[PDB]
Amino acid sequence: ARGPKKHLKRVAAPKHWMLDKLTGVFAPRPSTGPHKLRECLPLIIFLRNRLKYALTGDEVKKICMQRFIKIDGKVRTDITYPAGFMDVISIDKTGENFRLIYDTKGRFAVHRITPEEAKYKLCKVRKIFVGTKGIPHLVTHDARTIRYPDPLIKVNDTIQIDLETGKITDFIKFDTGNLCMVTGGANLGRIGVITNRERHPGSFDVVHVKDANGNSFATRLSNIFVIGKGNKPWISLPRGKGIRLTIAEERDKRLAAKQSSG
């Protein structure tokens, strides 16, 4: 190429968007924003494919630029605006609130939340640095810079932040025995408590996590988002509680649900 790309082919789109093959040759191509291209759900896919208020992209544009959709309390009219993990979507006209968090299968669940839960969000701290005139700054996973954080907050810790103002309100350390959710890799969407973090200098750390059913799985340190302190999550969880069922028990649950109703 001679410069940056503007198009996303539909088969080359992220698979967890759940787009089909025959609607077009193109996928909605997320704008630049606080989330990566491969780790976000654009607003057009949310309002059309998942939530089904709209039937076309033109109807998505008509919804969005009537100024109805807030992402983290800010009105967005970009139809391809990249929304990602822990982002709060508020529709004040229909009175709906959502958090973009993952299913046990690694797809952004339609997770409805309470309007008091939509006041805040959680962020994973990605860097701590001191800037000019000795002013400490943190940078989160969603491109937020906060000046003057708590001196106890470190990288990989999780801040509980207020969307009305944007300041630090509470925080959770990275420690063995805290609750976490996996935001990348093969264990995307699973939830469990951290049991062992092994360190590899000059390389990636590997965190071992144990499920509430006793299953154990490892990930990298980049894929760990600490959610709750010890055992109780600080946000609402989806219908599955991070418990990945195997295909056998999922078939059994489907058959029992078909037997009970019908």
Binding site: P136, R147, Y148, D150, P151, L152
Partner: peptide
């Protein structure tokens, strides 16, 4: 907002340094 945020960071830094030093004399006096 600059002078306000400087004020709360000054107070928080004072408290954090106090707790750290108190833990330091409590551990070193053994």
């Amino acid at each position: 907002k600059n002078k306000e945020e400087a004020a709360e960071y000054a107070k928080l830094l004072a408290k954090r340094m106090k707790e750290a030093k108190e833990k330091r004399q409590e551990q070193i006096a053994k």
